[PDB]
Amino acid sequence: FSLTKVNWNSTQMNQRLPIPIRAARKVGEVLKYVGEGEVISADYRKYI
Amino acid sequence: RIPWRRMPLEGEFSACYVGISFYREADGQQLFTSAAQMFDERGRGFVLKGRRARTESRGRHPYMAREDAKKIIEDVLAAYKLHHKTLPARVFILKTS
Amino acid sequence: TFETRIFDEPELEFGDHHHHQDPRLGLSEAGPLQTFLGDVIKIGVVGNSKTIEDTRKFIETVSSGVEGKGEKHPNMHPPFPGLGNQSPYRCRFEIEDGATAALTKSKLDKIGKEPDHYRAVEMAVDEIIGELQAMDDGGSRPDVAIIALPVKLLERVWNAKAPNFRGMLKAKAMGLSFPIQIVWEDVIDDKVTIPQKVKESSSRKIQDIAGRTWNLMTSLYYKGSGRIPWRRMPLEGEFSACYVGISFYREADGQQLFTSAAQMFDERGRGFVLKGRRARTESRGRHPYMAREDAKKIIEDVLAAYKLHHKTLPARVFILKTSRFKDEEADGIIAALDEAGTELRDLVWVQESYTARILRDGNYPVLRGTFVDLHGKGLLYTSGSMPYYGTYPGKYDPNPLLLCPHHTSESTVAQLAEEIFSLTKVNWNSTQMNQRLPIPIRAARKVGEVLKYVGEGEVISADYRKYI
Amino acid sequence: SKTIEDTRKFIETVSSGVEGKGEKHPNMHPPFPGLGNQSPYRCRFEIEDGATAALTKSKLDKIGKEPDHYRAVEMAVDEIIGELQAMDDGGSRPDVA
Amino acid sequence: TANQIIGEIGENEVRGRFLTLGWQFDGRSRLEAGIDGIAEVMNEGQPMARMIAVQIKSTKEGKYTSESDTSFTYLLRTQDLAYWRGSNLPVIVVFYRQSDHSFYWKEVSRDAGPGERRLNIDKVADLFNASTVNKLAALTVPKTGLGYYVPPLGGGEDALINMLPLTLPNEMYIASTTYEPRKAIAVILNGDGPKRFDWVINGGTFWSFHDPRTSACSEIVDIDQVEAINTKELALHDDIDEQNRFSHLLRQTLRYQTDSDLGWDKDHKALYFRAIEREVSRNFAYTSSKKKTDANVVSVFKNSKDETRVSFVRHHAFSPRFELMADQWYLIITPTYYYTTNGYAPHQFAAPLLAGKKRLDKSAALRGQVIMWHRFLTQPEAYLMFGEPPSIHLDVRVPEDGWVKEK
Amino acid sequence: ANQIIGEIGENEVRGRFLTLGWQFDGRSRLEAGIDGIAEVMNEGQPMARM
Amino acid sequence: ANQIIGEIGENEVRGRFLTLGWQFDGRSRLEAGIDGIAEVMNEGQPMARMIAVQIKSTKEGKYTSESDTSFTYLLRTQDLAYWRGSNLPVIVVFYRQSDHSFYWK
Amino acid sequence: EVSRDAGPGERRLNIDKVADLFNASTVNKLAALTGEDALI
DNA sequence: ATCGTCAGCTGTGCAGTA
DNA sequence: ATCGTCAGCTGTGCAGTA
RNA sequence: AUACUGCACAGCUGACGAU
Ligand SMILES: [Mg+2]
Ligand SMILES: [Mg+2]
């Protein structure tokens, strides 16, 4: 419950999922279309 | 630079938080695994980042195997020990399966 | 020309995250670092009937604001705020009516006939420890003990004419819950014509009635409550470090020599821990120099005691030793370190003299902390003139302690000089600002001074409350 | 460590003006004006403390002990690159290293 | 007119004199006639939130009431005193001189104390300038002093250091030796002519800076030629015992070749000043130009009441060491006293005589002792040449300029 | 226009201070937080209170 | 540090100006470009009507191509277009801390 | 106004609109400084 | 896979900053 | 094996609180 | 012995070498 409003894409307190689940889902959404041999970045700003 | 972070409590051990989640392939019916490896900085900061790797599919199941789970934890521990110059005292793992 | 640096005065942590360079002011302004739950401290007392009563009136009278020596320079002798509603310790202190010891006046004249003095110290201290054990047996256990000696029982136990005192009685007292505190009557009575031992003089002039109560109470509060008065602050980017210091004490008679040590580090919450070691430190040699075995043992011990509390391993190890760093034991130290895995290392040596005695233009001596790098040997002035006071506390010839780091160390000498300058007023004895020799060697001297004659049974309590 | 302290000292010294070599051929040796209001860049350089990589002496000792020429330079280069990569991934990104 | 314009240019110039060491003098409207703008104390880019009320008078040109370079016995009024005491902020008094553009301030407050008629004794050492600025910092902080204080106000002063650099000679001489040192001292003692002893002998070879046939005979040395080695190739590989042998070489060099040959004490260390005759004074005023010559070297102290008995006589002593601090030598000094009852027979009670003056007050003469001792040693062959210690730079100064001297 | 609104706010603050007959004098922009100095008088009683 | 050197340079240049009169106001902190307004004194009465003055102060250190006889300064064309469209002459001065080199251009 | 009491500072000033006015009324104030049962 | 002829282009290092 | 040179290394007493 | 400052004094240590 403490790790809930750490998500920086929004500003509401009406957040249900915690930050690591949301970050993992957004990382996967962006990673869905990346082909093999391309460059993937560890920077979080490329995913939100 | 990060706008805000949760307040750490007093007296708690050092720890790193790892999520886990899955996603599809947008043409076929498969599933991957992808996640972040967040923890607390040495000063006043928060490190939220992914990993520079893509896990393979290995079947249409939302559960991994005993060959990349060890690798993920090794990467998290190496990323913590490169910055804090020591290994942490606690590992927190969150999963959707 | 020679390069130099200066350092601002380091602060001390207190209650409410408060940082200040003046521990009296920080204690009086923000309370202790760790407050006590109950507002009670029970203190034992050994003495004749005159010392108990005026001790009670002393405890009563200090609770109303005993002022300093004078109105001028109002900050080296500050006004004591008392023990009521504004206390530096925020707790009350009292003598319970179950610790009111007295001494027999029968076994004196045949002691005054003086057949032997070693047997005299033996029977006197055996009676003292017997009374303390009989006090701790009942349901009137005190948190501390005052061992204020009778005058004739002391004058003829110190200059009994080769005796020893102030620590041998502790050396046969590692079995009592309360850590004892011997107090000579010089401030407890504060009127008696005390002799000056060898030089037949009037008395030892001490000070006024503010700073005495201040540092005495501070020592009593640490020794009684178990809570800790102060610590230095971490920095936003500091790694994890442990401080170990080694001293080179003599025998009980002074032919062989043994090596004592200390240990300190931080806490997981808001605290500081300073321990000795509950083991013997035998010689295996005669010349005053280290061995591989003792250095490896103390390094393994400090690593184990850090991992017991923090559940991690420290990223930095700091050693302050009073002799040459040679490879006969540095191999053991380094091997124990990468056996653990600690990355940053430091090995600093002290006591090289006649190196620099820098002066200034004016009348006063140098400031507190003028550090100079003499092409590797960094000399610093832990004492000197001091601006918040407005005066110069000190007589003449302030010694610039220098740092000779071993070449295995990974840091610059200026950074280590700043770190040791932040590690001067951190020991839990008295409230004095100037502390030339650092705490890791200070505590090592303080444990070796009681270990140099008894280690035969009665293993030490490493809680440091019986070492001040 | 010593390289970092001398780098900070170098920046601090050269930010406050630098004298010319001599009066012989003045256009060959013009004086540096420093990063003040007379700066020939209209910007200033600062070394933030949140990202600064100090190299431990154990790793340098291991570098100076390898007899093989190729892999020693390779591992030194790779270690520096890993330090800079972990510098980049965090929230303490510098403009130039 | 004249007075108003010269007063406003005076307040402009003292605003600049405020500004030259921080001290942001923020002005105000002139509608009080007796207080200027409020100054705010600052410390090297950081304001310290400390403020001083300032007031400035018009000008001072030429001579005035008891005007002098040091005395300046000027007296002010008494009507303004209450006007200058009915205040909370510490009001400071300011005047301006057009002769050397200087600025007068020597008073802040007296707490309702009529001290004569407001004496302004100025230019004794320095006026309101870069020197003695902590006299302005310790104004709003009173003698009550709970926790508040002021750090030293910047400045930056030089300071001396007490090791004299040495320039050693160019050559050194070695030879073979098949003898013993107890024979050497015997032939030195029982020999006929004059002799010196600026040599040492190790177990295998010779160690000196003199001839195969020295002025102190040649019996101890061999019949072979001594070998000429330059001093820039000397023991620079290993074996600090060779450095110890060079130390004994330089030890005998300083012991048997000095200026106005002294005696060599073994109580403190090294050398000490002698007595020229039977219990007489010993001054030897000398200087390296400047404007002050030497004050004292050796004095005679007598009994307080028993005039027919002498108490003691003290001389000055020091002890050089051996430190190759980065291939550059340094002789290290320790100024101490040595006591006797006649100048030749050693004192049996010299322990508490070193204290006293070491106990009484501050140093107040250690700089002078360092200066005269560094000038004393810088004056057939001498086999030595001495230099001058460096002066290091500090960013901080002691606030004793703003403090009170010891009484 | 942040300097403009800061200056007009300072001037109007000084005007409301002074229309009741209370002194207030601003400072330069070399400060940090101390935006001015105020001394109080009432019916011509200007004591040196800061 | 460089913010206070400009203020003290302006103050002492004004002290030089007020030395022989030359009534100078300075500006507030709202100014941009041109500094305060000054006049010329005539033996104790402001006979001159008005003129504009601008301060320019620098630290210790020589100027560009300064070799014992001269130096050079370059002017931004925004400032030049600012002063060209005006109703008052302007003057430009220099630094004062080496040997108080108040110059007029 | 901010106080000078011992300890920490007092941030987060709360200002009302009744007695904090800068009119002639409040001139001399700053001049004195010198459970529930649910079911599843 | 070698040897003279001519014609030109990259690595690797030392003084000297005129 | 005590005498010299050189560097520590460790124990005991006064005083003055500026 | 509240300590922590210098001073003075004493003992001890190791580094080289002999008629
Ligand atoms: Mg988005
Ligand atoms: Mg004690």
Residue numbers in the entry:
A (entry chain I): 438 to 485
B (entry chain I): 244 to 340
C (entry chain E): 2 to 162, 179 to 485
D (entry chain M): 50 to 146
E (entry chain F): 6 to 384, 397 to 424
F (entry chain J): 7 to 56
G (entry chain N): 7 to 111
H (entry chain J): 112 to 145, 161 to 166
Excerpt from the publication:
The short Argonaute-based bacterial defense system, SPARDA (Short Prokaryotic Argonaute and DNase/RNase-APAZ), utilizes guide RNA to target invading complementary DNA and exhibits collateral nuclease activity, leading to cell death or dormancy. Based on these structures, NbaAgo is divided into a MID domain (amino acid (aa) 12–50) and a PIWI domain (aa 250–485), while DREN-APAZ is divided into a DREN domain (aa 1–146), a bridging loop (aa 146–161), and an APAZ domain (aa 161–442). Collectively, these experimental results led to a detailed working model of NbaSPARDA that highlights the importance of the transition in assembly form during the activation process. gRNA loading, tDNA engagement, and guide–target heteroduplex propagation lead to the “monomer-dimer-monomer-filament” transition of SPARDA complex.
The filament is composed of a backbone and an inner layer. The backbone is constituted by NbaAgo proteins, with the APAZ domains and guide–target heteroduplexes positioned at the periphery of the backbone. This organization tethers the DREN domains together, forming tetramers in the inner layer. The filamentous backbone is formed in an open-ended domain swapping manner, and the intermolecular interactions occur at the MID–MID, PIWI–PIWI, and MID–PIWI interfaces in an asymmetric manner. Specifically, NbaAgo.1 and NbaAgo.2 are connected via the PIWI–PIWI interface, NbaAgo.2 and NbaAgo.3 via the MID–PIWI and MID–MID interfaces, NbaAgo.3 and NbaAgo.4 via the PIWI–PIWI interface, and so on. Propagation of the guide–target heteroduplex leads to a dramatic conformational rearrangement around the PIWI domain, particularly the “sensor loop” (aa 280–307), which is pushed outward in the active complex to form the PIWI–PIWI interface that is required for filament formation. Notably, group alanine substitution of interacting residues at the PIWI–PIWI interface disrupted filament formation, abolished collateral nuclease activity, and eliminated the defense against invading DNA as revealed by bacteriophage infection and plasmid interference assays. In the structures of the guide-bound and inactive complexes, DREN domains are flexible; however, it becomes stabilized by forming tetramers with D2 symmetry at the inner layers of the active and substrate-bound complex filaments.
